[PDB]
Amino acid sequence: SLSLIAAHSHITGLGLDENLQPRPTSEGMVGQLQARRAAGVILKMVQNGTIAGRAVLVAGPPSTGKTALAMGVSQSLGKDVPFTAIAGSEIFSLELSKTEALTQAFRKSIGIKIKEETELIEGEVVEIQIDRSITGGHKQGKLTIKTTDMETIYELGNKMIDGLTKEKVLAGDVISIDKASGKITKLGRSFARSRDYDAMGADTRFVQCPEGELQKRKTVVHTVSLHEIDVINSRTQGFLALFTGDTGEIRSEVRDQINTKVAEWKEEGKAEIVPGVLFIDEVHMLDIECFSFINRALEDEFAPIVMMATNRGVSKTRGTNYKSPHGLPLDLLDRSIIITTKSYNEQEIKTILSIRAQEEEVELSSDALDLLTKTGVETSLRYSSNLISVAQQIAMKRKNNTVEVEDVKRAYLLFLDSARSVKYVQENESQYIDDQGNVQISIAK
Amino acid sequence: KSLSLIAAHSHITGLGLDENLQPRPTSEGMVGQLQARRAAGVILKMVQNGTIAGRAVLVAGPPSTGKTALAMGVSQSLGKDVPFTAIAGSEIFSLELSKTEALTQAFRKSIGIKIKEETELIEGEVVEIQIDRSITGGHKQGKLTIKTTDMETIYELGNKMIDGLTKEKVLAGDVISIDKASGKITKLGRSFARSRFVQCPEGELQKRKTVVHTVSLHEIDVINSRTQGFLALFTGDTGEIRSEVRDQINTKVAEWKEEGKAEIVPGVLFIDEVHMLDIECFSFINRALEDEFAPIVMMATNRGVSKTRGTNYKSPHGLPLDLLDRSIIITTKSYNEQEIKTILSIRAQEEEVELSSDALDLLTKTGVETSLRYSSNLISVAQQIAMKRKNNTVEVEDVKRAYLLFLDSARSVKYVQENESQYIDDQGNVQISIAK
Amino acid sequence: AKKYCDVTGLKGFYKSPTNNIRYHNAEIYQLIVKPMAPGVDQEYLKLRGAN
Amino acid sequence: VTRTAAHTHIKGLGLDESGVAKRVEGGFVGQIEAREACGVIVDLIKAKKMSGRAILLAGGPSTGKTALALAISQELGPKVPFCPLVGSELYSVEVKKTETLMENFRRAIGLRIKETKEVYEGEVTELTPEDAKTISHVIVGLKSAKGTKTLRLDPTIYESIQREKVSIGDVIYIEANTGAVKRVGRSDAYATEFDLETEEYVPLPKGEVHKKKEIVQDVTLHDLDVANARPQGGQDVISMMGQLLKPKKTEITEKLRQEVNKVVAKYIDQGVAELIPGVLFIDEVNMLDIEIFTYLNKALESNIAPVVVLASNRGMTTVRGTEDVISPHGVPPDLIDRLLIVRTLPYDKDEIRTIIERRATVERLQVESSALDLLATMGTETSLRYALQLLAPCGILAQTSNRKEIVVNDVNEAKLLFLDAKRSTKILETSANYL
Amino acid sequence: VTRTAAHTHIKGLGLDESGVAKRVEGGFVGQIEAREACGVIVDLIKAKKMSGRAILLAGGPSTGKTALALAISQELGPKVPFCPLVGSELYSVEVKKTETLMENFRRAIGLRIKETKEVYEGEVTELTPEDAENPLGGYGKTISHVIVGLKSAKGTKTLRLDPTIYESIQREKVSIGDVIYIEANTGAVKRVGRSDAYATEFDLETEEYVPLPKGEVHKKKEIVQDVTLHDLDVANARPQGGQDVISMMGQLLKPKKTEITEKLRQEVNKVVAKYIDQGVAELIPGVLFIDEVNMLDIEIFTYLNKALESNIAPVVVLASNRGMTTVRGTEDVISPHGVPPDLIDRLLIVRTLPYDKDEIRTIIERRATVERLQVESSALDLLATMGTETSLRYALQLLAPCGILAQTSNRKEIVVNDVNEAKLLFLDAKRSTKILETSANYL
Ligand SMILES: Nc1ncnc2c1ncn2[C@@H]1O[C@H](COP(=O)(O)OP(=O)(O)O)[C@@H](O)[C@H]1O
Numbered sequence A: 001s002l003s004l005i006a007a008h009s010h011i012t013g014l015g016l017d018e019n020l021q022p023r024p025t026s027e028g029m030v031g032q033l034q035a036r037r038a039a040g041v042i043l044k045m046v047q048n049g050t051i052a053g054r055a056v057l058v059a060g061p062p063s064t065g066k067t068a069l070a071m072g073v074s075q076s077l078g079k080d081v082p083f084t085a086i087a088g089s090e091i092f093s094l095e096l097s098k099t100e101a102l103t104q105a106f107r108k109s110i111g112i113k114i115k116e117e118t119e120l121i122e123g124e125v126v127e128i129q130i131d132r133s134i135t136g137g138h139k140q141g142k143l144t145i146k147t148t149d150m151e152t153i154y155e156l157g158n159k160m161i162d163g164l165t166k167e168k169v170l171a172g173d174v175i176s177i178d179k180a181s182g183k184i185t186k187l188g189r190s191f192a193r194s195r196d197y198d199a200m201g202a203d204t205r206f207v208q209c210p211e212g213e214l215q216k217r218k219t220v221v222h223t224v225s226l227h228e229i230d231v232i233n234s235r236t237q238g239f240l241a242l243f244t245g246d247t248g249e250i251r252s253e254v255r256d257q258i259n260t261k262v263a264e265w266k267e268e269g270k271a272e273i274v275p276g277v278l279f280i281d282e283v284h285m286l287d288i289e290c291f292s293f294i295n296r297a298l299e300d301e302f303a304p305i306v307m308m309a310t311n312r313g314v315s316k317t318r319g320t321n322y323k324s325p326h327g328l329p330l331d332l333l334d335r336s337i338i339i340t341t342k343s344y345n346e347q348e349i350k351t352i353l354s355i356r357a358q359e360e361e362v363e364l365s366s367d368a369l370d371l372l373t374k375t376g377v378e379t380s381l382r383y384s385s386n387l388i389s390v391a392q393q394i395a396m397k398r399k400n401n402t403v404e405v406e407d408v409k410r411a412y413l414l415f416l417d418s419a420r421s422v423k424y425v426q427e428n429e430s431q432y433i434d435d436q437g438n439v440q441i442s443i444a445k
Numbered sequence B: 001k002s003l004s005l006i007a008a009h010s011h012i013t014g015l016g017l018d019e020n021l022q023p024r025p026t027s028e029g030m031v032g033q034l035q036a037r038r039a040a041g042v043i044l045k046m047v048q049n050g051t052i053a054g055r056a057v058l059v060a061g062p063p064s065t066g067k068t069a070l071a072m073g074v075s076q077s078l079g080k081d082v083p084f085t086a087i088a089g090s091e092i093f094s095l096e097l098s099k100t101e102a103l104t105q106a107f108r109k110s111i112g113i114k115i116k117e118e119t120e121l122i123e124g125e126v127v128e129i130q131i132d133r134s135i136t137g138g139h140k141q142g143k144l145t146i147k148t149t150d151m152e153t154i155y156e157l158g159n160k161m162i163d164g165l166t167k168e169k170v171l172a173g174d175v176i177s178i179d180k181a182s183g184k185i186t187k188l189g190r191s192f193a194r195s196r197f198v199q200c201p202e203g204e205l206q207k208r209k210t211v212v213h214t215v216s217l218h219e220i221d222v223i224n225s226r227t228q229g230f231l232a233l234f235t236g237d238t239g240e241i242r243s244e245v246r247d248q249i250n251t252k253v254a255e256w257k258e259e260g261k262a263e264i265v266p267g268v269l270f271i272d273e274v275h276m277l278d279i280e281c282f283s284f285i286n287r288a289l290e291d292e293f294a295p296i297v298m299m300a301t302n303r304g305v306s307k308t309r310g311t312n313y314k315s316p317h318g319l320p321l322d323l324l325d326r327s328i329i330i331t332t333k334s335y336n337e338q339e340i341k342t343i344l345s346i347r348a349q350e351e352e353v354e355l356s357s358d359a360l361d362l363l364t365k366t367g368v369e370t371s372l373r374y375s376s377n378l379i380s381v382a383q384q385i386a387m388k389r390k391n392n393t394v395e396v397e398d399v400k401r402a403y404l405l406f407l408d409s410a411r412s413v414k415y416v417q418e419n420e421s422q423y424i425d426d427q428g429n430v431q432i433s434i435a436k
Numbered sequence C: 001a002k003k004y005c006d007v008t009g010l011k012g013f014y015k016s017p018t019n020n021i022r023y024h025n026a027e028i029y030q031l032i033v034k035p036m037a038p039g040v041d042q043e044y045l046k047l048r049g050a051n
Numbered sequence D: 001v002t003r004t005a006a007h008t009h010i011k012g013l014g015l016d017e018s019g020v021a022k023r024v025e026g027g028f029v030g031q032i033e034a035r036e037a038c039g040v041i042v043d044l045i046k047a048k049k050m051s052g053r054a055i056l057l058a059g060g061p062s063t064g065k066t067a068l069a070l071a072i073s074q075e076l077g078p079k080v081p082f083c084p085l086v087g088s089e090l091y092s093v094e095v096k097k098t099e100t101l102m103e104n105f106r107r108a109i110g111l112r113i114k115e116t117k118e119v120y121e122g123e124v125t126e127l128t129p130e131d132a133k134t135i136s137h138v139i140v141g142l143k144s145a146k147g148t149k150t151l152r153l154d155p156t157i158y159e160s161i162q163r164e165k166v167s168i169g170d171v172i173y174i175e176a177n178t179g180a181v182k183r184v185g186r187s188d189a190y191a192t193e194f195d196l197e198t199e200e201y202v203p204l205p206k207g208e209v210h211k212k213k214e215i216v217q218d219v220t221l222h223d224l225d226v227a228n229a230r231p232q233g234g235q236d237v238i239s240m241m242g243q244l245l246k247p248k249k250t251e252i253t254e255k256l257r258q259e260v261n262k263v264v265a266k267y268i269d270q271g272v273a274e275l276i277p278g279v280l281f282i283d284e285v286n287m288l289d290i291e292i293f294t295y296l297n298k299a300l301e302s303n304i305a306p307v308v309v310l311a312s313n314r315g316m317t318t319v320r321g322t323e324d325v326i327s328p329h330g331v332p333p334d335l336i337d338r339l340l341i342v343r344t345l346p347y348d349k350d351e352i353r354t355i356i357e358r359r360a361t362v363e364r365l366q367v368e369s370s371a372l373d374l375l376a377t378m379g380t381e382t383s384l385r386y387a388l389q390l391l392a393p394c395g396i397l398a399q400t401s402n403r404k405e406i407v408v409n410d411v412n413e414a415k416l417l418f419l420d421a422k423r424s425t426k427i428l429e430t431s432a433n434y435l
Numbered sequence E: 001v002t003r004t005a006a007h008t009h010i011k012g013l014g015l016d017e018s019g020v021a022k023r024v025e026g027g028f029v030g031q032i033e034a035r036e037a038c039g040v041i042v043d044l045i046k047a048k049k050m051s052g053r054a055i056l057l058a059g060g061p062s063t064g065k066t067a068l069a070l071a072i073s074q075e076l077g078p079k080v081p082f083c084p085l086v087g088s089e090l091y092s093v094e095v096k097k098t099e100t101l102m103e104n105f106r107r108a109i110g111l112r113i114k115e116t117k118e119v120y121e122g123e124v125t126e127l128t129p130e131d132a133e134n135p136l137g138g139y140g141k142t143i144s145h146v147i148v149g150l151k152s153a154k155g156t157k158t159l160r161l162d163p164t165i166y167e168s169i170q171r172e173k174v175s176i177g178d179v180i181y182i183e184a185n186t187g188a189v190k191r192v193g194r195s196d197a198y199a200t201e202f203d204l205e206t207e208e209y210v211p212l213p214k215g216e217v218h219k220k221k222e223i224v225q226d227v228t229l230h231d232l233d234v235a236n237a238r239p240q241g242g243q244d245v246i247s248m249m250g251q252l253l254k255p256k257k258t259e260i261t262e263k264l265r266q267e268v269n270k271v272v273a274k275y276i277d278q279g280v281a282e283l284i285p286g287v288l289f290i291d292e293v294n295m296l297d298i299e300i301f302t303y304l305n306k307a308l309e310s311n312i313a314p315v316v317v318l319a320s321n322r323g324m325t326t327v328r329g330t331e332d333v334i335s336p337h338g339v340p341p342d343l344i345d346r347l348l349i350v351r352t353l354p355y356d357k358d359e360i361r362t363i364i365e366r367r368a369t370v371e372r373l374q375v376e377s378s379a380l381d382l383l384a385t386m387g388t389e390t391s392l393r394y395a396l397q398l399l400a401p402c403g404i405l406a407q408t409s410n411r412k413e414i415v416v417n418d419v420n421e422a423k424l425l426f427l428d429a430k431r432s433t434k435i436l437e438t439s440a441n442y443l
């Protein structure tokens, strides 16, 4: 929960009914009824989990709500479903190929669900004794574990003994031992022994002594993506590559082995497959090789549902020398269904600006909101959305709690949009460095 | 100290200037370019004052007319314990470093940190060494009789000093230097005794001397970086030192400067042939000259309205106009016959080549008619013709023999243009057959 | 115990090997410690009882 | 004494309590509207509520965009993080440019940690271990000039002490919270056990044995990301040599960033840590690639993205990485929808003269009144930066002739010796052989 | 009998004591002025007083530029370091071309070092380690010392060894009865082999049986070494040779080319200057030869412009066969020989002239003499006319198929019919090009 007020933090799910019918303004989403209904259909396709490898293109003009629709789909999906939102330029790597980055993004968006039982015995040890036998081949021990309420004695096997010799226990530190799994961890020393040793050290930490029942039962559900299994089985200590990203072109034989073992676990009942969405924001910034691999990797059984967003017209495909619709080749557009987003009118711009003002805790007047709506009709919507939050700071600088028309006018004067800046550049083109590198620095001749 | 015999700029011992920053016509191996030498003396005083940072200096002119000579004069008149990084334009195109990172390392190699510290040293001639050992060698007794020319003393040595004396074997008559703290014992050699050789030290034995260190900011950057140790100053695999280490080093240097623990010694970064950089490097130079710990950057170029690298347009000196906005430009001029004759006389007396008057006049004529560097290179290659016929002084016909043996640019271009079929053109067409 | 110069009572860094007398610096050694009469050293050392 | 490098007369935006810019305040001359806009931006940063707020300030070269960015960084103080960046720095040969952009994004989000420094120091007069071959507790009695102090110790500190070969009489350093052990050296009481000895001897510290201190740890999110994603492994506190395998930058995954954000939020909810969002300032943005420009669109919509400030001196220029996308300031239109543009105006003769006088005052130079208008005329005729950079040769040519005043002859001499870009290009055009 | 490959018929420039070239001496035919210029350059290198003197060999294909450079290398001798190079060899995928050029610059400067070595050698008689009181203390080695008994011819010795010396003792698998060689300079230990005083025929390892080393066990021997500055640079950059941890791990890692810093090169120059100052080292500058110099791009050309003004740079010899060709990496500049004019201004161009018919004929005759093939006068005249008609190299490389065709007919001489059949079997560039124009499918 380290979130400030983002670009679209007001959107909590698509505002749909039980019949996949969009409400006009609910769950932070205003308008775009056909796009929201199609996004609800795609969300039901994801939640069904039986259709795999479908490509969806969310196409429209800039500042319309394509990535807003993707954020709504991600928020309406809920937790424990793998959603991977990447930009189009994230796959041009130096340590990975474009195909390897593509398939790593593909396998990050489909996962398995594992349910396991934990019989946790978490407590502070009272005393542990080492029974060094004369033979030395076998060691037995009695573990005096305690909480703030009860204290029990546990007989201890030899594997417990040399697993507690490692991560060594010093009679008063909080540990937690599983019964069936046999996992050991050392959470740290108790707060009762905080003033015992006069200096902490490096590898120690102070934790509270646990309370209540000593032996606790908890079912914990793990959602593991296929990319996690790939990175783990790609090496001997693979989690360092999982958190540093130094996987380095995992070979396809371990991917086929992992797919076979995942199908074996699904048929056996050890885990169940949880598919998700891979959202490639700004998909027009991809090479034609990445496009062909996207076409031919969507036909795999373990493929997620790919949502693509673009705002390009009939633009040039990257890596080629011809133009194409949406910046995508026609074979990729053949295997896709296009959701189109329409431009807004005055009422929808007013409602979006009001919702964005409420999300930023900014209070506006009625005529100030009318001026902001007129600015968002003439200029773009994002310009007025930023003008709201800078007119708020003007209002607090003026010792006022509400944003009036004068604050919006001052913010309009201070901060320029695209059209005013391009007109002011074209009027004084000699003062700027042009494409030929010529500029007039001096103000007089 | 650090000897190398003859170089191209070895005759230059600095800018020849008086106390009033006016250039003598012939001083310190530098003749001509009086306005350029005066401007370079002004830049040298800008460096020597040390109160002004991040100034771009551009040295522009025709090729082979006093550009790198001016930088070598600035570096020679700068004096030691002041950093002078001399890099080229093509030196920053690394395979394990970015261009901005290599430029940052070249910038920070030219700012020195002046630190004075006191140390204790014991230096003298060993008279007698007496270690008594046991069977196991755990406990040992020692007696070190050491002397200088003024003193004699005897020391009882602990076990660690006995171990450090048996290691790096010291005998009687050796002259050694001992650091009491680190325990390093350096054998300076043997004393003057017939029955390599170093004079016996004089005066005190336990000496307190002040050593003076000048460590560049790049060295502290490498050492403070926890990924690689100090050996990356020699191996060169520093590998993109992060900016937080740079900020910590800047704050610690600003801390040491206020408490008097250290001094700032700014230097000169000389980027020879600066036209080889791209527009990204030029903009990083533009934003890297507005920093506190930035040296005074001297750039040299001979390009005139050339294409900027990484762009598609033409710019003066190969540099964009925003970089030229931040630079003050020193212009070097071409030489007349007397300046060329004086340069040839200096280069001949540098290489120990005795010239006649007629050979000097011929060299001056072919210098003002072909190139200065051609006549500079003809001297050393005509001296071998002079000693090949057992003659000391280089005569006129030795210079004529070297002229007909070795071609300049114009004669080679004319010979290529007359025989264009014998050479490979742009289209890869050649004729090897001498018939037809 | 701290070692002091036998001539002046200063901090005695060195000690002459012939007459076994600790001294402070080079000037003291050249002036007093080296050109001294026999028997003077045995009563210099009598102060700290090292005779 | 002091070093001035094209700045350091800029002490701030020079505004009043109402956010109105005076004509001359804080070393700023003119530029009222952009200074007021930057003050509004500074208030928005100090509100610490919004994320991903991007502004771009554009204008002609030598008009004060970097001066305004440094004034913003001065007005925010040294507590708020500020990451100055050039657009060429994002192109790294070790890692991709989007990872470098994300690293510079997370370098501009800081944390404030209230931590306690506790130090035990002094001569060791008692070092007695207690076993049960396993040491149970360690009794250490330190000694300083103000008295002694006897401490228990866990066996880990004896492991560090035996690493440091600490014996009786060695003046050592012990940090209570972190367990760092440093051996300063032996004391002067044991400096006469041998006449010559390899050990170094430090005096008894005159302070107390137990010293307590409250200090403030200012870290960033990128520092925690680097410290949690070392590819080879951790290193000790004292290590003069690097690891034998070269550690290069790696594409840090989103999982590590999510876990770091979770741990930082958990420490914030306990009140231990305070989140200070800051400014990422990318200068000369017009040479960003279209890949970096496209990834900036996604990175600006993050929940923890800082306030991004861009500067460009281009007009109708092609975006780098494209071939026909003509866009204002070299910035693509889909990004330019996401920022607010602050126009930076050129100066007139009086403002140029006032800037010249301010820079001459901050460089400790006395300029005559007649030379100042000539320098202003040269600034209006060639460039402001040419007139600003000629003050130092003018001062040295004045000091050469034993004076503390800039006479008009010295300005004429400095104009004759050093040339601007216009006269250099005039020489370049009217010459035959490479200049 | 021997192996000859396009060369080795040239043993030198073929000059007298006055520097005047003869016509046919040293396997060289013609090129009097070029050979005299190369002899003057050879005298300049032998003067050992210059730095950065760069010449350029200009001429057409098959005119003798690489032959002249190899003749310079043969005339200077094996003591002068010669570094032949190709312009495309500077493009490396491990390090930048700047570093490769500077490495080849440092590889051409060598020096003769008179190095003294402290040597403990002999037959191992005893090997008794001394254990420590606490081996599991965490810090400190397991053993304290190792007593080594060494016996040589007329003398014996016992040595109490440091554990770090014992690591290098054990790593070469030293046992009792082995002749060893301990070098005290680096701590390196060489196991010479099993001693021959005991039995020999009872081993299963093909070991070397070595007699007792003469003289004392402890020795000081002076060894004359020949190293270059680049060898010292890569020794200090990748440190192997010590007994410390970094030296042992330096031998096991994959060797990679690194950017050698200017600080390391200046420190190496300072130590080498000190070694010269004591008189145990003598500096021998050499030749760096970069054949096909037209294939350098403008970056390496600009760094060559910078590095020719260094005070330690060797004598550089360049060769090209381009007339007016654009420099690689650039678009518009037309320059002679593919070399930019800023580098041309620091050069001394030596022109190499083409050959006549008689020079081609005696070149064919001398190459047939070196290849040990007998040719008659009519076949030699046919080969001369053939060489003037097509090229010199095509007549040069048709000598061996002519000898093969003569050997298949059980004859020793080469006749007109052998040259005719080698002409019919094998084609030159011009006839194959004429085949290429007159074809429908692309040939
Ligand atoms: N239907 C909508 N409901 C609520 N907010 C919207 C809607 N459409 C767009 N927005 C808001 O407009 C801003 C910019 O729209 P965005 O989704 O970035 O456009 P695009 O998808 O073309 O990039 C976002 O912050 C988003 O929250």
Ligand SMILES: Nc1ncnc2c1ncn2[C@@H]1O[C@H](COP(=O)(O)OP(=O)(O)O)[C@@H](O)[C@H]1O
Pocket (backbone or CB within 6 Å): B008, B009, B029, B030, B031, B032, B033, B062, B063, B064, B065, B066, B067, B068, B069, B070, B302, B343, B346, B372, B373
């Ligand atoms: N004023 C001078 N005094 C002595 N030598 C000079 C002078 N000017 C130029 N030279 C000589 O001219 C040669 C070319 O140097 P320079 O012109 O400074 O570099 P560049 O050729 O890169 O412009 C040098 O070898 C130098 O010896």
Ligand SMILES: Nc1ncnc2c1ncn2[C@@H]1O[C@H](COP(=O)(O)OP(=O)(O)O)[C@@H](O)[C@H]1O
Pocket (backbone or CB within 6 Å): B290, D006, D007, D027, D028, D029, D030, D031, D060, D061, D062, D063, D064, D065, D066, D067, D068, D311, D313, D355, D358, D384
């Ligand atoms: N209003 C001002 N007051 C004082 N100095 C200024 C003012 N505006 C600009 N300057 C100076 O002019 C120079 C402009 O350079 P800079 O801001 O780095 O480039 P740009 O203006 O192109 O962004 C700075 O060194 C700054 O010190």
Ligand SMILES: Nc1ncnc2c1ncn2[C@@H]1O[C@H](COP(=O)(O)OP(=O)(O)O)[C@@H](O)[C@H]1O
Pocket (backbone or CB within 6 Å): E006, E007, E027, E028, E029, E030, E031, E060, E061, E062, E063, E064, E065, E066, E067, E068, E321, E363
């Ligand atoms: N003057 C000469 N005398 C004898 N043989 C020569 C002479 N010139 C060239 N050759 C031979 O002709 C061949 C020419 O090849 P080479 O010299 O390598 O090419 P280039 O002439 O382009 O440098 C060489 O094998 C050499 O043996």
